[PDB]
Design a protein around this ligand. Structure first.
Ligand SMILES: Oc1cc2n[nH]c(Cc3ccccc3)c2cc1-c1ccnn1-c1ccccc1
Length: 207
């Protein structure tokens, strides 16, 4: 298991998200669904030139899986997936400029709901989750598990769990007072309100 420090601006953004009083927490789901949608567009675009890139799965979809026993909400996609490099430094480097602009916007009167306009919408997961686990599998690499409970660090390990073929799975270990995002009616309401025009099927699993 490898442990990494977040870049200073990312650690600062995650602390802001965890510490700021902000009741409109539900926007985390739109951000994660939007990220899943972008990765599905990426594999779809790549498959047009190289059809063999879909040999690890033709179906392009998003699954929302609540689990009251484990207190988790899992967002699963069959998108392009991430390499070890994407998890360790590639996406964290791009996120530095977006974090800075978002921080400036907040100081100028913007609110946490506009986070996605800065390409750092993923971190809104920490409005509701005490820990986030990300399992991913790209065609050119092995299966990896990224994990963080904030606090300035994240881990990356080769995933020994069940192979997922291709795509990304975001496991939100919810805070004790945020279990409403495990309720079927609540997830349905949020999906209809913020993610109604996503170009991929979104299946809300039931328990
Ligand atoms: O399909 C995903 C779902 C995601 N949800 N949230 C995260 C963010 C993230 C990154 C690193 C480590 C941890 C989280 C996603 C990332 C991916 C994904 C897979 C491949 N490209 N791509 C991606 C999508 C949008 C922006 C950047 C990359």
């Amino acid at each position: 298991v490898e442990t990494f420090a977040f870049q200073a601006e990312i650690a600062q953004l995650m602390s802001l998200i965890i510490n700021t009083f902000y009741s409109n927490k539900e926007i985390f789901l739109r951000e994660l669904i939007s990220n899943s949608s972008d990765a599905l567009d990426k594999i779809r675009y790549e498959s047009l030139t190289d059809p063999s890139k879909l040999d690890s799965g033709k179906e392009l979809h998003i699954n929302l899986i609540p689990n009251k026993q484990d207190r988790t909400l899992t967002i699963v996609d069959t998108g392009i997936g991430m390499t070890k490099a994407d998890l360790i430094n590639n996406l964290g480097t791009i996120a530095k400029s977006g974090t800075k602009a978002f921080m400036e916007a907040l100081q100028a009167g913007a609110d946490i709901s506009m986070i996605g306009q800065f390409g750092v919408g993923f971190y809104s997961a920490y409005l509701v989750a005490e820990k986030v686990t990300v399992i991913t599998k790209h065609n050119d690499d092995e299966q990896y598990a990224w994990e963080s409970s904030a606090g300035g660090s994240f881990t990356v390990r080769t995933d020994t769990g069940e192979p997922m073929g291709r795509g990304t799975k975001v496991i939100l270990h919810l805070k004790e007072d945020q279990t409403e995002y495990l309720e079927e009616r609540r997830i349905k309401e949020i999906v209809k309100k913020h993610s109604q025009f996503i170009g991929y099927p979104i299946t809300l699993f039931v328990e």
